[PDB]
Design a protein around this ligand. Sequence first.
Ligand SMILES: [Cu+2]
Lengths: 28, 21
Amino acid sequence: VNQHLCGSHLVEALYLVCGERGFFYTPK
Amino acid sequence: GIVEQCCASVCSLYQLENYCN
Ligand SMILES: [Cu+2]
């Protein structure tokens, strides 16, 4: 399903999706 | 970018995979 994710909620989802691999959080 | 689109619009978990290492 599509997601509406702002602020810390986006970082939560990135953590869930990427887990061990890690991720970059890069807003503008 | 995605930080913008997920919040101002919607985004999928599949789009989020683009940001994994
Ligand atoms: Cu909240």
